[model samples]
Target: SDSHPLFVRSLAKNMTWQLADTSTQKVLASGASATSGDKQSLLMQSVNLSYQEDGRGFNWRAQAALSLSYLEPTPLDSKFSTGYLELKMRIDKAPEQGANLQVMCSESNCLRDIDFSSFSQLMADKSWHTLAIPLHCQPITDALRITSQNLSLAIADVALTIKPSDDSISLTCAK
Candidate 1:
């Protein structure tokens, strides 16, 4: 309750997710910055993302929010790896099992994206399901186009909760 963890969360329902170069960590999250609040809500719409690089073909069809940058660099050291990228979401349609989910920290400069195979049946239910991703289980990657997949999901919130030392982290939607 005391430690002020660092993160980037949406400020308003109308956000401006942006075009970013994944290679450069400094060039991530263009629309909004991380607020001190807990849960971040969003307005769902399809977004096309284009990479600034040539020949690197980006995911133009997938859905993405706008982008922004941290005032200071977030630490992506080994400690962060022990944490998890947790997504609070609900599939608007009939969800499929064994479907893939791509997460990243932009290179955890994510500060990055890797997909997870193991999720919950709750993820399919219209109601919210807790999609908890263990940090150690994630892999370093170039990336994936998370937009055009199987079903449409309403992402309530996305967070990186540190796996406790005694067992850890703090998850709250911030301002």
Candidate 2:
């Protein structure tokens, strides 16, 4: 079976989130969460981030960004099955509005910064949009630094998913 247990970062579970300078390592804690399935979306905001390919394969390093990252408690699952990095989400905003969402993954397999920007249709639309980006041939790990820059939208029901195609089925679960 292509099933895999998924553990999304539930913002309401701990109400533990913070604002940080994604460019820097500075962190600021805050209680900014609502209950009862209340949706608290970020206002019109923009972030800027960059990840340059340094020295190619010899010595590689990448830069990542994220407006609100899971600092702790329930971090993003580092395991991946298929090469497809699917994002199950819905854009609950005005009619026809898009955001510049940035996602970068770095690993020994995905050892360099690769952009899946060529994929997805989040540039414009106000519906239940599902994005499928091809992740590098590597499972996302805690070592993969994620950052946010030049952001421009607020989506909801976001779930980080994987296809798990051709992956092992030793201990499969549903995500």
Candidate 3:
């Protein structure tokens, strides 16, 4: 079957993802700047699995990788800030169905949904990993916190379902 075309855009435009001197800004990836490679990998597939049986039930997936390069050596006193990377996914500007997904780390943890201060390492490895962040788990602010030194934020994978509500299989249906 032919695949549907889906356009995925980055939210960051003029924002900076790296924290350091001028050199750091140059070496680190910019939050606002979306590279072609990142774009391609960020949003991977948009497929329509069912038409008759499932109606307009469809699925979409996105993946992204970020490189964290430090222009200068890490500073002991310079601590990382606290913030969340907000990733918004909508279909035609309306809220999409299914759960929201995200992968975050802090000084205390690596990729767990506990607290915002669990990441403490740099994300410069450029290694891609899988993180399942539910849409409902996302905070209202739509921003992920940044905590640590010389950290590079990269989204590995994102998936969503665009299935239209099945009235026959819903609670609203009269038994």
- Scored by lDDT, the top model is 1
Estimate the Cα RMSD of every predicted model relative to the unseen true structure: 12.3, 13.3, 16.8
Model 2: residues >4 Å from true position, as ranges? 1-19, 22-25, 28-64, 67-79, 89-122, 137-150, 155-175
lDDT tens digits, residue span 45-134, model 2 = 211112221100100012222333333434234553343343333333322222233333323423224232322344335333434434
Off by over 4 Å in 1: 1-77, 94-99, 105-117, 138-145, 164-175
lDDT of 2 at 160: 41
Mind sharing the TM-score for model 2?
0.38
Scored against the true structure, residue 118 in model 2 reaches a CA lDDT of 24
Candidate 3, run of 10 with poorest lDDT:
165-174
Distance from true location, Cα of 110 in model 3, Å: 17
True lDDT of residue 102, candidate 3: 20
| Model 1 Cα lDDT, one tens digit per residue, 81-136 | 66556544555554242234444434344323333233334344556555545544
List candidate 3 stretches off by more than 4 Å. Answer: 1-7, 12-126, 135-139, 156-175
> What local lDDT does model 3 show for residue 109?
27
Q: lDDT score of model 3?
A: 0.24
Query: Tens digit of lDDT per residue, candidate 3, span 1-175?
Result: 1111111132233222232222212123433333323233222222222221111111222222222222332221111122122222222211122222223333332322322222112112333222222222211121222222122233311222122122211111112
